[PDB]
Amino acid sequence: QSVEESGGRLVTPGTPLTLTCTVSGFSLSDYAMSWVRQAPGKGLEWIGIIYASGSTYYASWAKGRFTISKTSTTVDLKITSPTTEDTATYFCARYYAGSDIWGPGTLVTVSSASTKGPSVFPLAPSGTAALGCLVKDYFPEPVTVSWNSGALTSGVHTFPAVLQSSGLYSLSSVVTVPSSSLGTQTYICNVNHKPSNTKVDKKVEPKS
Amino acid sequence: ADVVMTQTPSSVSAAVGGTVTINCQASQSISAYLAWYQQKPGQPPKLLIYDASDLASGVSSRFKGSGSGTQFTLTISDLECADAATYYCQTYYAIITYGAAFGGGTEVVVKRTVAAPSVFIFPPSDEQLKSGTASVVCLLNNFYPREAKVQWKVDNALQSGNSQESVTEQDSKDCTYSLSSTLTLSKADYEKHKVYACEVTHQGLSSPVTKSFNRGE
């Protein structure tokens, strides 16, 4: 039994947006489902629930601002007239005794700003050495970073994004490795910014 | 009106092996219809406890729920670095009448011995300089506690207003933090100065550590 949210994207204020929760391994004729959201850095907020028999109930602030509906195997959340209060990760969750099955979430960004893909720059290494990638000037969130296609995980730190005063995000990802490996191993950061279709592999090496 | 769950404190701490206590107060009686969740950074919430005191399958009995009516507690014993997370309660009493609000959350901070950061400085890449901007990065790796002081100097002049810090959450194995401080200058300004220096002060360092480079060397 699992669920997965989709449809989170950048939208301009006032543009209705529908998110979808796909369910698997249980029936919506047997279980109620809720939608929950979480603004960056903030808490969980219960939006509403749709019971097996179809009745919907909303938090007091959600009434008239969201519509929950369902098909035989999906649950939708329509955000009637998005504002920046609606920039958040949205989750669907199965109700049984509390909410037991949750999806990974889908991210909604409400803004008039345009999508922009990042530039990726090396943080070049100077018995433990550090190296990294600077992922600069992108919009909206999110970006993911891996190292050596996921083969390098020990010692990796990918920092939370910062919103710069320009309105664009930045982050770095770093890793510490043995200094003796700089001459012999290859270190590549794999950067993905799905909103702009950007996927970059950057080899990071000592500067000559 | 919707039930309100008042969750306190906003953060709670104990050493590895210790115990913390997290409280929720419901605005009216919700009987035993209360759940507790753990949320690690980047992940969805995970159900720990339902019906106030029943463990979700697979969850460690280190997590104990108690209470009824209007007062509930989550007690986490034998604390581990992997317990560093935010925890939430939620009502599910009579949702059709009262909603299913979450409490505001409580962070858990897992305490450990002092660990000094390793410090590294990175000059801007030549590629970035083509943009007309230079980013200089100072990395503080794997330190505890969180408090750390980063000083930037350019040709021995103290800088402020042109840097931003980012910090990771506590590592799930070693309880440490890592931190980046990024100084942003125009290329034009970067090329007017020679010495770029990051000086770090931290409880684990007997005196401050400075990492520096000379532009062009």
Author numbering:
A (entry chain H): 1 to 126, 133 to 214
B (entry chain L): 1 to 217
The authors write:
Nevertheless, X-ray crystallography of Fab14 and hBSGΔ–Fab14 revealed the structure of the extracellular region of the hBSGΔ–Fab14 complex at a high resolution of 2.51 Å.
